[PDB]
C-alpha cells in the first residue's frame, strides 16, 4: 500500500545493512580474496542500485522489503540456472 512519509523512518544505517544482506544472500563467500575482486565490487554496486530503485518505487516499508526480497530471489534463481547449465 501507500504509507506517506515512510522514508522518514528508514535510517541510512538500515539501508546500508540491507545492501550488505543483498550481497551476502546472492554471493555468500568466506574467501577474503573476493571482497577485493572486481566481480564482487560489481555485485555491491548492483545491490546498491536495486536498493535505491526499490526505495523509490515502493510506497511503504512493507512494499520495500517485499520488492527487495523478490529481486534477490530472481537473481539467485538466475545464478542457480546458469550454474547448472554451465559448460
Amino acid at each position: 500500500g501507500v504509507r506517506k512519509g515512510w522514508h522518514e523512518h528508514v535510517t541510512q544505517d538500515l539501508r546500508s545493512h540491507l545492501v550488505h544482506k543483498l550481497v551476502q544472500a546472492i554471493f555468500p563467500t568466506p574467501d577474503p580474496a573476493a571482497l577485493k575482486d572486481r566481480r564482487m565490487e560489481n555485485l555491491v554496486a548492483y545491490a546498491k542500485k536495486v536498493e535505491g530503485d526499490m526505495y523509490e518505487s515502493a510506497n511503504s516499508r512493507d512494499e520495500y522489503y517485499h520488492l527487495l526480497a523478490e529481486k534477490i530471489y530472481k537473481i539467485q534463481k538466475e545464478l542457480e540456472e546458469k550454474r547448472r547449465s554451465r559448460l
Binding site: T11, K21, L68, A69, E70, Y73
Partner: peptide, 26 residues
C-alpha cells in the same frame, strides 16, 4: 514451477526485516 518460490521470498523478507532489531546490537 519452483513450488518453493513463495517460501523463499518469505524467508528473504524475514532475513531483511530482522535487520531492524540487530541494529540495536551492543
Amino acid at each position: 514451477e519452483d513450488p518453493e518460490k513463495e517460501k523463499r521470498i518469505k524467508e528473504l523478507e524475514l532475513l531483511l526485516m530482522s535487520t531492524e532489531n540487530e541494529l540495536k546490537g551492543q
